Amino acid sequence: GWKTNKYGTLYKSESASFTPNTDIITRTTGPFRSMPQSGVLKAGQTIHYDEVMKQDGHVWVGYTGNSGQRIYLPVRTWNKSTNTLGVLWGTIK
Ligand SMILES: C[C@H](N)C(=O)N[C@H](CCC(=O)N[C@@H](CCCCNC(=O)CNC(=O)CNC(=O)CNC(=O)CNC(=O)CN)C(=O)N[C@H](C)C(=O)O)C(N)=O
Numbered sequence: 001g002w003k004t005n006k007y008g009t010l011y012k013s014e015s016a017s018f019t020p021n022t023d024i025i026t027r028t029t030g031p032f033r034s035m036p037q038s039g040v041l042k043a044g045q046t047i048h049y050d051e052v053m054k055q056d057g058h059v060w061v062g063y064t065g066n067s068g069q070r071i072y073l074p075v076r077t078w079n080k081s082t083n084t085l086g087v088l089w090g091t092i093k
Contacts, residue, residue, distance in 0.1 A: 041073055
């Protein structure tokens with residue numbers, strides 16, 4: 001199913017690979033666009049995530065970056081009122 005954290009983020013464990021088809025802004029700290037930008041995952045650059053979150057109008061995946069800091073990558077839009085998902089911005093493998 002899902003779990004809900006202190007901050008009303010829906011989350012659960014899920015290990016797989018995401019290759020974006022477009023440049024996506026990654027965040028530090030948590031799955032919100034108001035969070036500091038960690039950087040940009042470029043089109044075709046595969047990452048291996050261990051977490052999935054629904055929050056701030058998006059489905060995010062969370063992984064551990066190259067400084068042991070968690071990185072939050074948005075992969076598609078999510079309306080919580082309808083639980084509707086936009087096109088995935090890449091392929092899960
Ligand atoms: C229970 C119910 N849902 C509820 O009403 N909760 C509120 C939360 C209020 C709160 O915490 N505010 C923050 C500032 C938030 C605005 C600022 N927003 C944030 O900081 C957001 N923070 C994060 O997202 C943290 N990162 C993650 O979580 C990453 N993990 C996941 O996303 C999912 N995975 C997991 O969770 C794994 N276990 C605040 O006051 N901060 C003060 C200083 C402090 O702590 O004293 C409440 N009244 O308690």
